[PDB]
Each structure stands twice: as structure tokens, then as C-alpha cells.
Write a protein that binds this ligand. Structure first.
Ligand code: HEM
Ligand code: HEM
Ligand SMILES: O=C1N[C@@H](Cc2c[nH]c3ccccc23)C(=O)N[C@H]1Cc1c[nH]c2ccccc12
Ligand SMILES: O=C1N[C@@H](Cc2c[nH]c3ccccc23)C(=O)N[C@H]1Cc1c[nH]c2ccccc12
Ligand SMILES: Nc1nc2[nH]cnc2c(=O)[nH]1
Ligand SMILES: Nc1nc2[nH]cnc2c(=O)[nH]1
Lengths: 390, 390
């Protein structure tokens, strides 16, 4: 027989029909990834949660030489185990402090001013505008520059590094390594500036070195937090914007009841299709999952949108609903590798969307949603441009 | 039977197989355009040249209400007849003077400095780089700002207007009009600045008004020359860059024999697939073309890549050849509507490519060519990003 192909459709404004078929017919399914390797794709909520919470399915080992892959590695293999290294070298406190919105008491107001500065610029020029290049991208880059303690002068160059680093390729491509060492050197340069960095992660790193871990490791943590955070928050915010543009009753709700923003972002997180690949794990032992015997060394892929649209857990999953009794979604993952920046991720989006619905109350797409250009060959699903009117 | 669909593949680094099949099997072919309308697609060189040179096939009338269309009009219908209006209002001299590289004796050196400034910035940051956002786009925008006599401060906003204005849509979309009047107002504002514009097209327009045509018409000419010129030169240069990256022997030729740049750009023009739609005409009378009787009022579409790859006129058309005995290509069209800026278009590309092969002698793509993202739904074919190493 012929295996289902993975990944699924690049279109991000509706659940791929194949994700619903996989969950209903084979919630654990043998698929052929873009590399030609085979994998177990897990698409029901119950089994996805199980995999994430069972440490016999290893994220760290997905980077090992010889294992099957959903796409070529574009970063050093130790970086897939970023949190595992952050913990072992005594970096966790500096990292966890940086990721905590409660440790930066100005963050809230500063993010709000950043959002409004960007939106005011767009309003001055008049519609239409591209809310990716004109809003999400600079806003997400500005946040992560603040997190690291670096200026925003080179934010376009840094976001362009993300455009290469998060490519999904069937085979390794020259360029991934060149791109990695390019921005690793950038981070080293910032850490080792004569007027040594204060503020943010690089400021904490500078202090940590003078106390009684190498420069390459410090910059690696800085670079991978910048790239992973900026690309994930920018892509999620783009998906959230599309929802509020296509469903203006949701923006009316946010304007009428500003305090629902927390629940609203929690539901947009469940709904959002920005994860354009699956969460990967290598089985370290034989494990039975659902009706399938998974053998040690095989690749397991957790399909987050399959789980988050599972009607056994989320009634009317295809309908955005800010008033669900229960919303135990997997948008941030689960288990050991649950997103350590989930609070910052929520803050980023809540503040941006609050500013957006206030400043652009007639927000709508400037063209039918089916004519958005969805980026191919990337870890995230995202529109190449997000043209809107207001 | 089922008609062939138009447009053809968005992939721009190889001729679409369908373009070769159409030319060989039905060089005048009934096709279904993206609007659902029907058209005559002309794909052989002999018949394409015939249409372009026969004024019974009208460009001006392609904008008329009720006529069949290859895609929705995104601009006022009078703007499709831009040159026809420029001529009638006594604007031709100011326009033709602006479009002449010989009327701006600093242009050559200035373009060369612009190219090298952009490339030096990329070299300082190190590879990889996106040569669209980092080179073609700002270089093409800088040229057209110079042409008009406006500063480059808002070049990103202006190129984003191009991203909307040149969309191909099956039906009219809100946004096209909003976008047009947005940048029309921008051009009015520049023309009507208190420190009145000197220099360029707006400087000539300001003088022309005080002499013994409205503000809207003047800004319309400015806006449509900016958009058409910037989008066409940027897209062509991107296609030329891909060729020199994929065929480094061509860059060796340019470095060894700098004076061949004129012939080299002439061949890259024949080869280039940046025109992603066809040149449209409405038949004003019944005309027999090839084996087909075309009736008055029908839509005729000239497929430039079919003509420019016609082996009856260009031997080994699939192979770039800087030493062809004869190269009567249709990259700039033909007949009455032949590109009035062809000399500027050649200068733009010749200077950029000369700088490129000097500054990035090891230029190559940073990923297999098949993994470039080609933009959908646009008049031009272009890679969304052009990542390169050197
Ligand atoms: C809307 C925003 C975000 C979403 C949807 C998101 C989602 C996720 C998901 C699904 C995982 C689990 C991956 C797996 O299990 O294989 C994860 C892990 C991770 N994310 Fe987030 N992320 C977001 C923002 C951020 C931010 C702001 C940062 C950093 C500044 C960040 C840093 C990380 C790191 C370091 C990990 C790995 C954790 C580990 O391996 O233990 N993320 N994220
Ligand atoms: C590499 C660059 C360029 C290419 C490949 C190109 C190609 C063409 C083609 C194929 C046509 C004929 C359209 C038809 O017959 O329907 C045309 C027309 C035109 N182009 Fe160019 N173009 C380029 C650059 C420019 C520049 C730099 C400008 C302006 C600054 C410009 C302005 C125009 C105008 C106004 C027309 C309409 C002429 C008429 O209707 O009589 N183009 N171009
Ligand atoms: O910290 C990490 N932990 C895991 C899981 C993970 C966290 N955030 C992600 C966002 C997308 C994909 C995977 C992850 C990982 O795989 N790598 C990095 C992040 C990263 C930095 N640059 C990259 C280029 C390519 C892929 C990942 C990264
Ligand atoms: O001057 C023009 N003459 C014709 C032919 C033409 C010249 N250069 C082109 C480049 C692409 C497509 C058509 C043309 C036309 O159609 N319009 C305009 C150009 C233009 C300004 N903005 C636009 C948005 C959309 C489409 C065209 C324009
Ligand atoms: N595999 C994967 N891991 C992530 N961690 C955070 N975001 C993502 C994503 O899109 N894919
Ligand atoms: N139809 C059409 N006309 C043009 N004139 C200049 N460039 C183009 C193009 O790509 N398409």
C-alpha cells in the first residue's frame, strides 16, 4: 500500500482535511516524511498527550546521527536538547528569570507601547498594510531583542536568519551551517562587547562568567531562544490576526470585555495552525500506543492540530469559542518539554491583540482569505504577507 | 473537451513544460483564465510578434467593462492606457526625458555606487543573504525614487504597495482601489510639497504646470511608472541572479570580459521568466491568426516565454548563450506598446550584475533551486526570498 505523506497542507486558515481523516481512521499512522523516512504520526488528543508525557519518547535523540527524520537538521544536534544543556550548566536560573514576564515589571507597558507605535505608524500611512512585516515581525523581534539585552538595530537581519534556520528540507543544505555560525558570531560579539552588556539574558550571562560553560554555549542559548521565540510568537500572532479579521464578532467581544483577553488567547492558541510540522520523538524502548506497537529507534510525530481539534475533548472544535468550560489544549506541548516561555507567549499575544482591536476596529483582510500566500518548506505555517484593511 | 488552464506554473527557473506543449501543438489555443473567462493564448514567436505589431489587437481596450479578462483589474481602466494618455496631454517629453539614461549623465555612476553600497552591507554581515530584500528590491526602489525625484525614505512602504497592486485575482478585491488611492495621494503630496520638487519626473511636472492636465493625472503617471518599473526591474534582476548563481561559468565570462555585459543581459532577457501572465489584447475586428479565426471582442494573450523559447527562432532555446548570432527576443514586447524604458531596464540590470559578479565571485544558491518559494497570485514570477552564499 501507499503511505500518507507528511507534512500536511501549508494552508493555515482551516484545519487540513487530512488531519481530521488521520485522527478518525488511524490516530497512530505510518507516514512517509519529506525525507523519505517513515514515522508514526499521532493525531488524537489522548495519544498525543500520552507521547508528550512519556519520557521513553525522546526529543533529545531526534538529533542523533542515523535516526529517521521528518526533515534535515539545520542546527547543531546539541541545540535540539537546548533545555537539557541549560539545566546541566547552571544556566536555568538566568534563563528562567529571562523568560518570566513577572521578572521584568516594565514588560507589560513596554510591549503595549511597542504595539501602539507600530500600529500608529500604519494608521498614519493608511490602509492597506502588511501586518506581518509592519507589525508581528518587528514586534516579535523587539521583544526578543529586549529579552537578550541587545539593540533592535539589526532586527531585519536577525529575522532573515530565522527565514533560513527554520527551513524544512529533505536533505541537509549548505547554508544552514553557514547561517547558524553567522548569527552565533553575532551573539558572541554582543556578549563580548567592551561596554559589556547589562540588561537581559546577555547581561545575566556576563555576570555569570565573572562569578566563581563557554562563550559558544552562552551564545548558542541566546541564539536559539531568540530564533525559537521570535518565529513562534510572530507566526502565532499572524494566525490570531487572521481569526479576528475573518470573525469580527470576536474583536467586538474583546473590545466590549477587555478582561476576556486571557481566555481568548487561550482559545486562539488551541485553534492556531502555526505549527507546520509535528513534535518529534525517538522511541527509546518498545512501547504500545493505541493499537500500534512502536519499536525502539523509530520516529514518532505528535500532530498538535489533530489533538487540539479532537472532538472527544473539544466540542465543535472547528468553531472558535472563547467560553469553553475546559480548554486543556496542547498548543505549548506537554510533559517534560512543555514550552518554558508559555507565559511570555501569552503576554506577547494578549497585549498585541488588545492594541490591535482598539486601534483597527474595522480590521478585515484586504483580499479573500483563500488568496493569501502560505509559505512552503518552513517549520511554521504563515502567510508570506498579511494584507488588511481597516 | 476541457480547456487548458492559464496562467502556467509559478516556478520561474525552468520553462513550464506546458509552454512548450502549447507552442508545439496549438500555438493559438483556447484557454480558460483564472477568472473563468476564455481567451486565445498565443505561444509561437511568429504569431506573438504578429499580434504585438497589429494594432487591431488593442491593449487599451483590455480595461473596458464587460470584456473577458485574465484577472481582475486592480487599477483605474485609463491607467492600462498610460502611454496613450501621456501622449495626449503633452506629457511625453517629460516622460521620455525621465526614461532616457542619456538624459541623466550621473545615472551610471550613481547606480553603480548604489549596487556596491548594498553589496558591501551584505558582505559586512556575511553569508547567507536574501538578495531580494537585501539587493534587488532596494536597488530597484532607489532607481525609481530617483526617476521621480522623491526621497527613498518610504521605499519599503512603496514596494509594499506594489505587492498589492500587481496581485492577480479572479474577482475584484476590496483593497486594490484603497491601495491605489493610498499611493496616488502619496504622489500628490510629493508633487505639491511647499518646497516644490525639483529633479526627476515630479520636478518636470511642477515646471510643466506653471507653463502656459490635472494633479490626479500627473500623480497617476508618477505612480504607475514607479510601480511598473520597480516591479519589472526587480523581478527580472532576481531571475538573472538565479541564472548566474546556477551557472557560474556565466559569471566567469562576465568577470573575464566585462564588455559582454550588454549581450549577456540581452540573452538573460530572452531567457527570463519574470513575466508571469501574458500580454493582453482585445480584438477590435475579426482577424485570422495562424489556423484560428479570432472574433472581435475576444481576449488574446501573448505568451512571451513561448515566443522567446521558440526553436524556430532561437536554437537550443533552453540553454543560455551569450554568443547568439541573432537575438530578436520579445522580452520588452513589440509594436506600438514596446517598453518605453527598455534602455533604462538594460542599464539597471547591467550595472547590478557587473557589481554582483565582482563583489560575490563565489555566488551560489544557499539551498537547491527546487526549494525556492515562488510567489503565487502575482503578475510577476519571483522567489519570495533569494537566499545565496558567496
Ligand atoms: C506563541 C508562542 C509559542 C508557541 C505556540 C510555542 C510552542 C512550543 C511547543 C509546542 C513546544 C514543545 C516542543 C516539543 O515538545 O518538541 C515548545 C518548546 C520550547 N519553546 Fe515554546 N512556543 C512559543 C513561544 C516561545 C518563546 C517566546 C520562547 C523563547 C523565548 C520559546 C522557547 C522554547 C524552548 C526553549 C522550548 C524547548 C523546551 C524543552 O525542550 O524542554 N517558545 N514551544
Ligand atoms: C527589465 C525590465 C522591464 C521589462 C522586462 C519590461 C517589459 C515590458 C513589456 C513586455 C511591455 C509591453 C506590455 C504590452 O505590450 O502589453 C512593457 C510596457 C511598458 N513598460 Fe516596461 N519592462 C521593464 C521595465 C520598465 C521600466 C523601468 C518602466 C518604467 C519606469 C517601464 C514602463 C513601461 C510602460 C509605461 C509600458 C507601457 C507602454 C505602452 O503601453 O505603450 N518598464 N514593458
Ligand atoms: O531550543 C530548542 N529546542 C528544540 C525544540 C523547539 C523549541 N522551539 C522550536 C521551534 C521550532 C522547532 C523546534 C523547536 C529544537 O528543536 N530546537 C531549539 C529551538 C530552535 C532554535 N533554532 C532552531 C532552528 C530550527 C529548529 C529549531 C530551532
Ligand atoms: O503603464 C501601464 N501600462 C499597462 C502595461 C504595463 C506596463 N508595465 C506593466 C507591468 C505589469 C503589468 C502590465 C504592465 C498596464 O496594464 N498598466 C500600467 C502599469 C501598471 C502600473 N500599476 C499597475 C498595476 C497592475 C498592472 C499594471 C500596472
Ligand atoms: N517541532 C516543533 N517544535 C516547536 N516548538 C515550538 N514551536 C514548534 C514548532 O512549530 N514545531
Ligand atoms: N501583462 C504584462 N505586461 C507587462 N509590461 C511589463 N511587464 C509586464 C508583465 O509582466 N505583464
Amino acid at each position: 500500500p501507499p503511505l500518507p505523506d507528511f507534512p500536511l497542507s501549508r494552508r493555515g486558515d482551516i484545519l487540513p482535511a487530512e488531519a481530521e481523516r488521520l485522527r478518525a481512521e488511524q490516530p497512530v499512522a505510518r507516514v512517509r516524511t519529506m525525507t523519505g523516512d517513515e514515522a508514526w504520526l499521532v493525531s488524537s488528543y489522548e495519544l498525543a498527550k500520552q507521547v508528550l508525557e512519556d519520557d521513553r519518547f525522546s526529543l533529545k535523540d531526534t538529533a542523533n546521527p542515523g535516526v529517521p527524520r521528518q526533515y534535515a537538521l539545520t542546527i547543531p544536534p546539541e541545540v535540539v536538547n537546548n533545555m537539557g544543556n541549560i539545566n546541566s550548566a547552571g544556566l536555568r536560573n538566568a534563563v528562567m528569570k529571562t523568560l518570566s514576564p513577572q521578572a521584568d515589571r516594565e514588560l507589560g507597558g513596554w510591549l503595549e507601547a511597542q504595539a501602539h507605535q507600530l500600529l500608529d505608524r500604519l494608521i498614519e500611512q493608511g490602509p492597506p498594510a502588511d501586518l506581518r512585516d509592519g507589525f508581528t515581525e518587528p514586534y516579535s523581534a523587539a521583544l526578543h531583542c529586549r529579552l537578550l539585552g541587545i539593540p533592535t538595530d539589526d532586527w531585519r537581519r536577525l529575522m532573515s536568519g530565522i527565514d533560513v534556520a527554520f527551513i524544512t528540507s529533505p536533505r541537509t543544505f549548505e547554508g544552514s551551517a553557514v547561517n547558524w555560525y553567522k548569527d552565533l558570531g553575532y551573539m558572541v560579539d554582543r556578549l563580548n562587547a567592551d561596554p559589556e552588556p547589562t540588561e537581559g539574558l546577555l547581561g545575566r550571562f556576563a555576570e555569570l562568567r565573572r562569578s566563581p560553560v563557554s562563550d559558544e554555549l552562552l551564545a548558542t542559548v541566546a541564539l536559539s531562544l531568540f530564533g525559537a521565540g521570535a518565529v513562534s510568537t510572530s507566526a502565532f500572532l499572524q494566525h490570531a490576526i487572521i481569526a479576528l479579521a475573518q470573525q469580527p464578532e470576536l474583536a467586538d467581544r474583546l473590545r466590549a470585555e477587555p478582561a476576556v483577553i486571557g481566555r481568548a488567547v487561550d482559545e486562539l492558541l488551541r485553534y492556531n495552525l502555526s505549527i507546520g510540522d509535528a513534535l518529534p520523538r525517538i522511541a527509546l524502548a518498545d512501547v504500545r500506543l493505541g493499537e500500534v506497537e512502536i519499536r525502539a529507534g523509530e520516529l514518532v510525530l505528535v500532530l498538535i492540530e489533530g489533538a487540539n481539534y479532537d472532538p472527544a475533548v473539544f466540542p465543535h472544535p472547528e468553531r472558535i469559542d472563547f467560553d469553553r468550560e475546559s480548554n486543556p489544549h496542547l498548543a505549548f506541548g506537554g510533559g517534560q518539554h512543555f514550552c518554558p516561555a508559555s507565559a511570555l507567549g501569552r503576554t506577547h499575544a494578549e497585549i498585541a491583540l488588545t492594541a490591535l482591536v482598539e486601534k483597527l476596529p474595522a480590521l478585515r483582510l484586504a483580499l479573500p482569505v483563500e488568496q493569501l500566500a502560505w509559505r512552503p518548506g518552513f517549520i511554521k505555517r504563515l502567510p508570506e504577507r498579511l494584507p488588511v484593511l481597516w
